[PDB]
């Protein structure tokens, strides 16, 4: 050759040169050569990189300035550099206020501009994978107060273990306040780690609750205070209801009871107190869900489901529901089971008599075809003038004003009994852990906390402020401001109240004017998930409520493209859909591009859809992206596209909660309980194969809810060293069972954790290593974990999300029709925002598909960054697991 190499790049500056000298040195890693001849930029030693800068007037300030602004449109001769890990330089430029050009933003060539524009950077000569990247001590006291609430045992188990782990004596105050006031070894017993064995399954409270008359007065409050100082209890944890916590709050303010009658007064000077709501009611104001609320809701829905599971004219059914102060149970049961009329204290009849209101609503429903009328009566069922409405009162109206043979079903203690539902077990446990930390982290300047859940996230809220707020609600009801009382309840309550009345109301004129009425379609994509049918039911009934035309795309994208599966949704046909498992519409894993994308687009324009709601897993996630990317070709797709994640796995980015995961969690939790119970009957372990695919979410949560010793997850895998360590753990566990409760042992293994070390292989290794001291058996239930009848939570969440989806389509349809009716569509930012994923984040938010697909997902064969890391740490803590 003759052009043998490349010595240096020569740049000419106007007259000033320094701005560029600062750029290439800070941004590129160059350096000024020692002792400058006039007033050379080399990179490093043992190299050949050089850039010459001359101040000779050969380049104009006016031309260069115009060229820089000219480039701000996303052609010119340039120079490219060989540089490893371009990703780091791109971030450094962008954040430094410099624009950059790149290939997939993953990335291949990077290109920026200085006073000397178009300074390119390549990561290699020709196409190939790139150049490799270069180089504190205090003793705790637990108590339970008020009526039995499922989840109280899981909470106490958590407090006993958490406190023990944090290195402090845990005392269980038997018979709540009574035990606290009476004191002594009789009621205040020191609790060990093995003493709270298998309490997850146990119903009610093993410690016990008692209504203490003395503690209501300063007489008892003082006696209780003495008993704590005598027992050496430095901190109190109360798990109970409203008054149960208000009484604890009063005890907190009244704590300065120095009473001379100083060593002890010096040490035990401040009251470390923490609250957790142990109620079925869900009446406490600063939390979204109280411990026992969803299990109670579950008992109610279990009864309503059995009632609906039959034939018949002239029949009405009354479900008498426990829950004295709040209407949350009534409202949510009513929503989950699509009840005709609910009698709750927050929404009594106002413009007309409750009998007239009920008869009208019930009548309209029967008239349109609904033969099984279900009426839910709250314990706090009341009229305007605060007169309590009884079941018999309601029964006589149905029997005498209408011709209905009414049969009353009253749950009673059923609503407090049984094991805590997966949500209650997971949440009560984490609350127990938090209550301990809160109590330890507490300082005299910190206001006494109450552990609260705020949109699936554990938080600390001041107990005084929560006590005050609940009183404010009670005041609003008593002062007859029900509209106010409703707004004073949590944002979920107000949304559910709105969701229920709208879905309950096709049989009343539409709420939108003719112009604002649209054509919204719904599809189910992926494997079935509990709530798919509920999302469809709620969306269709809400559409009818607004005046929209709800369309159902039967059997996913394959059904639309190959068979024109656009079908109308009739209110009578969808009767009981909210309670049905699977997908009535029909779901499959077929992607829009695996079905004809042109045909999907053709039918979208033929039926003139104003929006689309996708209910499904990762395939529905890819589907969104595939439909969004096809918008350039098809104007028919330039409409709001919304995804409501539905997978038992919880592998879809954008949400922290996917529809059907609670249904699935609960069915597997019920399965694991039976398996552990069986292990408890025989020195045996069970290796339980878990579903969820490449997502370790279900095994994580099942480990916490069931008390499994280990959970093998796809994100971590299974190492031989960890397997040997964990087997030695089992060896020691059984050697230490001599004396303690026989609760049984579980190991949960997600099928994807190891392709080699399978459930069956793992178990045979345990037997080999066990040397006859114990045995191992597998439990492989299979891809049946989906579950039938969806959980009340799933039915309720699906309703909420389906409505938020319709409401988004309402908002964005006007903007879309600009891109729809126009060609020359250049695929802007205003349009990409309409193709979105509805999700829970800490907040319920819609996230554009673009950011989640490109950045938040393993788009490839994995189909899945996790959030459940803390849950994992706690479940290993609670079971004594040692990682590597």
């Amino acid at each position: 050759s003759l052009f043998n190499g490349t010595s240096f790049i020569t740049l000419f500056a106007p007259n000033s040169l320094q701005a560029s000298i600062d750029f290439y040195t800070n941004f590129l890693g160059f350096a000024i050569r020692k002792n400058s001849n006039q007033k050379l930029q080399l990179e490093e030693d043992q190299n050949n990189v050089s850039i010459q800068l001359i101040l000779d007037p050969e380049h104009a300030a006016s031309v260069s300035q115009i060229d820089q602004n000219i480039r701000n449109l996303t052609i010119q001769s340039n120079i490219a550099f060989k540089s490893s890990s371009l990703s780091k330089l791109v971030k450094l430029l962008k954040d430094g206020g410099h624009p950059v050009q790149q290939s997939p933003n993953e990335i291949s060539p990077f290109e920026v501009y200085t006073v000397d524009p178009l300074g390119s950077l390549i990561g290699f000569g020709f196409k190939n994978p790139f150049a490799v990247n270069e180089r504190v001590r205090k003793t705790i006291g637990v108590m339970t107060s008020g009526g039995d609430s499922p989840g109280m045992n899981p909470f106490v188990r958590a407090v006993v273990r958490a406190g023990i782990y944090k290195g402090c004596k845990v005392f269980c105050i038997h018979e709540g306040y009574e035990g606290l006031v009476r004191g002594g070894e009789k009621y205040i017993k020191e609790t060990q780690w093995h003493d709270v064995r298998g309490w997850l399954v146990e119903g009610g409270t093993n410690i016990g609750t008692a209504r203490c008359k003395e503690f209501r007065e300063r007489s008892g409050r003082l006696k209780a205070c003495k008993n704590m100082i005598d027992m050496g209890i430095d901190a109190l944890i109360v798990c109970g209801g409203d008054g149960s916590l208000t009484g604890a709050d009063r005890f907190r303010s009244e704590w300065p009871s120095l009473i001379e009658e100083q060593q002890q007064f010096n040490t035990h000077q401040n009251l470390n107190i923490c609250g957790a709501v142990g109620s079925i009611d869900n009446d406490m104001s600063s939390t979204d869900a109280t411990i026992g609320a969803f299990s109670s809701l579950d008992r109610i829905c279990r009864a309503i489901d059995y009632i609906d599971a039959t034939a018949s004219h002239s029949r009405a059914f009354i479900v008498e529901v426990m829950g004295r102060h709040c209407g949350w149970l009534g409202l949510l049961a009513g929503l989950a089971t699509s009840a005709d009329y609910i009698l709750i204290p927050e929404k009594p009849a106002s413009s007309r008599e409750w009998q007239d209101q009920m008869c009208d609503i019930v009548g309209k429903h029967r008239a349109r075809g609904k033969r099984k009328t279900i009426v839910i009566v709250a314990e706090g069922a009341i009229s305007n003038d605060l007169s309590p409405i009884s079941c018999d009162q309601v029964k006589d109206v149905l029997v005498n004003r209408l011709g209905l043979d009414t049969r009353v079903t009253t749950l009673g203690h059923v609503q407090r009994g049984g094991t805590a539902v997966a949500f209650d077990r997971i949440y009560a446990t984490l609350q127990g852990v938090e209550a301990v930390n809160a109590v330890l982290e507490c300082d005299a300047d910190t206001p006494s906390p109450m552990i609260a859940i705020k949109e699936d996230q554990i938080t600390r809220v001041p107990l005084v402020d929560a006590v005050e707020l609940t009183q404010q609600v009670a005041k609003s009801i008593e002062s007859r401001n029900f509209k106010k009382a409703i707004s004073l309840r949590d944002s979920e309550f107000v949304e559910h109240m709105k969701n229920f009345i709208s879905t309950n109301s096709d049989h009343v004129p539409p709420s939108l004017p003719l112009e604002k009425r649209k054509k919204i379609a719904i599809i189910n994509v992926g494997a079935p998930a509990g709530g798919m049918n509920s999302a469809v039911y709620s969306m269709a009934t809400y559409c009818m409520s607004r005046g929209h035309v709800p369309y159902a795309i039967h059997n996913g994208f394959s059904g639309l493209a190959r068979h024109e599966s656009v079908r109308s949704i009739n209110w009578l046909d969808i009767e009981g859909w909210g309670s049905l498992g699977g997908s009535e519409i029909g779901t499959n894993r077929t992607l829009p591009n695996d079905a004809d994308i042109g045909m999907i687009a053709y039918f979208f324009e033929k039926y003139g859809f104003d929006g689309l709601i996708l209910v499904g897993g990762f395939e529905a996630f890819i589907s969104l992206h595939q439909l969004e990317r096809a918008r350039i070709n098809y104007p028919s797709l330039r409409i709001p596209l919304v995804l409501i994640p539905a997978t038992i796995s919880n592998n879809v980015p954008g949400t922290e909660y996917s529809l059907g995961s609670d249904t699935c969690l609960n069915s597997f939790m019920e399965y694991c309980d039976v398996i552990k119970q069986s292990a408890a009957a025989t020195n045996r372990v069970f290796v339980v194969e878990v579903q969820g695919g490449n997502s370790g979410y279900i095994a994580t949560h099942a480990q916490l809810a069931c008390g499994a010793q280990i959970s093998y997850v796809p994100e971590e895998g299974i190492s031989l060293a960890q397997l040997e360590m964990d087997i030695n753990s089992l060896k020691e566990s059984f050697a230490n069972d001599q004396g303690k409760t026989k609760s049984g042992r579980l190991i949960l293994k997600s099928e994807n954790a190891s392709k080699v070390l399978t459930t069956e292989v793992i178990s045979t290794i345990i037997d080999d290593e066990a040397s006859g001291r114990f045995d191992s058996k597998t439990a492989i239930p299979g891809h049946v974990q989906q579950g039938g009848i969806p959980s009340p939570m799933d039915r309720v969440r699906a309703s909420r999300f389906a409505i938020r989806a319709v409401s988004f389509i309402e908002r964005h349809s006007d903007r879309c029709q600009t891109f729809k009716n126009s060609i020359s569509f250049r695929q802007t930012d205003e349009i990409t925002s309409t193709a979105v994923v509805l999700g829970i984040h800490k907040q319920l938010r819609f996230t554009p598909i673009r950011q989640l697909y490109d950045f938040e997902s393993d788009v490839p064969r994995r189909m899945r960054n996790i959030f459940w890391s803390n849950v994992r740490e706690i479940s290993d803590m609670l079971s004594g697991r040692t990682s590597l």
Binding site: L514, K519, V549, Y551, R562, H563, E564, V566, R567, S568, I597, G598, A601, Y602, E605, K606, Y607, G608, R629, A630, I632, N633, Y634, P635, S636, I823, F825, Q827
Partner: protein, 170 residues
């Protein structure tokens, strides 16, 4: 074993002629279902004979309109005589693909014409007088019209031409 006619394609060199043809059928009841331009994201199914721009217009078939009394909307294939097939089933079935060639090369237009079916002969005649020209007929043809493309209009292979909502059988 040809079932029927899929579509008619009209190719032009002049962009001004292309856009004016698009707007002509747009006023006549056509809807652009697919669009193309010279970006690597665009899907390619048709593009020869290549093309710089392509607009696929569809005058959707007639189906049995649904009552809900509010304003009238299209039904589904829950319709009167819908018979589901291996692919799609069995509705008055017309799409016209408009293609745009480069600056240069390209053949001249030949003499042939297409005759489309209309169950609204007078309603179409009225839009044409409201828009373009109305040529007098020869031979089933009711009348004819033009743009850079000359087209004929009549009734389909059936006896007569607009009952979209059909009579359910006994």
């Amino acid at each position: 074993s040809i079932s029927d006619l899929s579509f008619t394609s009209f190719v032009t060199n002049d962009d001004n002629l292309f856009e004016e043809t698009f707007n002509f059928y747009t006023k006549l009841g056509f809807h652009a279902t697919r669009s193309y331009v010279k970006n690597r994201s665009d899907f390619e199914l048709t593009g020869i004979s290549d093309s710089i721009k392509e607009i696929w217009l569809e005058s959707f078939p007639l189906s049995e309109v649904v009552e809900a009394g509010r304003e009238l909307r299209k039904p589904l294939q829950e319709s009167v005589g819908y018979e589901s097939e291996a692919l799609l089933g069995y509705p008055y079935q017309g799409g016209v693909v408009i293609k745009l060639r480069l600056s240069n090369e390209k053949n001249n237009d030949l003499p042939g014409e297409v005759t489309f079916f209309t169950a609204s002969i007078d309603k179409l005649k009225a839009k044409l007088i409201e828009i373009g020209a109305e040529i007098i007929p020869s031979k089933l043809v009711e009348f004819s019209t033009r743009d850079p493309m000359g087209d004929v209009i009549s009734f389909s292979s059936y006896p007569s031409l607009s009952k979209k909502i059909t009579s359910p059988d006994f």
